[PDB]
């Protein structure tokens, strides 16, 4: 792949429909750990061992402790230069009749906070619940989400489980339902929303430039989106602190923190 910023910017000048795919690396500079770097451990586990319906089936208190911790940490976090460059790019191009869409694997909502409008949150949101009984999806920013979680979620190895009885975890308040809530987050082994996937496929099929930013490109189906676009002959530029298994499929690779490279690229 080319590291020519000038060649990328020639495509960027002409592009009518840009898809920006992001992962946890785009939020690293807001002081939010990635999943596979740092930093990624919560007590003894990584996200892949907790973000699963089997963890939730057999220890919903532990899974809730993890998501609670993340919710409370994320409340104080701010968009960084990469999130702003992405939002500002969308705004500026929109006034020219040019489309920019963000397809994010992040559930942190920082793209929303940055000012991105055309946002596809393909793994859900830290700040939404879904009821395991009635299926209702609700926005939830309550701190703490339920009283039993107050002061819980401490991330240090050696921290004891809160072991909250299931009745005292977050419960559904729709129509007296009372059902156990889960995070409205896509877990390993679970299907992404088919309606979201249909929107993604239409953006990928019609875009004429693609950036893939801060993702390890190992989680599917997301990891195949930018390669799909590249394989149509459309230029794809990867922005990452390192190379990934997808790097060689792409037209461009810009190594470095995306809070530096994205403002330059999208200027």
């Amino acid at each position: 792949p080319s590291s020519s910023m000038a060649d990328f910017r020639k495509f960027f000048a002409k592009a009518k429909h840009i898809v920006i795919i992001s992962g946890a690396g785009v939020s690293a500079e807001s002081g939010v750990p990635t999943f596979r770097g740092a930093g990624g451990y919560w007590r003894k586990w990584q996200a892949q061992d907790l973000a699963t319906p089997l963890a939730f089936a057999h220890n919903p208190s532990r899974v809730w402790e993890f998501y609670h911790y993340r919710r409370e940490v994320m409340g104080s976090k701010e968009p960084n230069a990469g999130h702003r460059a992405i939002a500002e790019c969308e705004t500026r191009l929109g006034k020219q009749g040019r489309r920019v869409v963000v397809i994010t694997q992040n559930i942190d909502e920082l793209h929303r906070k940055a000012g991105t409008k055309n946002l596809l949150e393909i793994h859900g949101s830290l700040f939404k619940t879904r009821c395991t009984s009635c299926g209702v999806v609700a926005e939830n920013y309550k701190s703490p989400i339920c009283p039993a979680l107050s002061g819980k979620g401490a991330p240090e190895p050696g921290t004891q489980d809160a072991s909250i009885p299931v009745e005292k975890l977050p419960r559904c308040e729709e129509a007296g339902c009372g059902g156990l809530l889960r995070p409205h987050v896509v877990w390993f082994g679970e299907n992404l929303d088919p309606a979201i996937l249909e929107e993604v496929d239409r953006e990928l099929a019609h875009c004429d430039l693609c950036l893939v930013v801060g993702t390890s490109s190992v989680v599917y189906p997301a990891a195949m989106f930018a390669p799909q676009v590249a394989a149509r002959g459309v230029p794809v530029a990867e922005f990452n602190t390192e190379t990934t298994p997808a790097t060689n499929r792409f037209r461009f690779h810009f190594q470095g923190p995306c809070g530096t490279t994205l403002p330059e690229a999208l200027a």
Binding site: Q48, H123, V186, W187, F188, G189, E190, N191, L192, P194, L197, V218, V219, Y220, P221, A223
Partner: peptide
């Protein structure tokens, strides 16, 4: 294809 996996 629609399942979150690694992949």
């Amino acid at each position: 294809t629609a399942r979150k996996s690694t992949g």
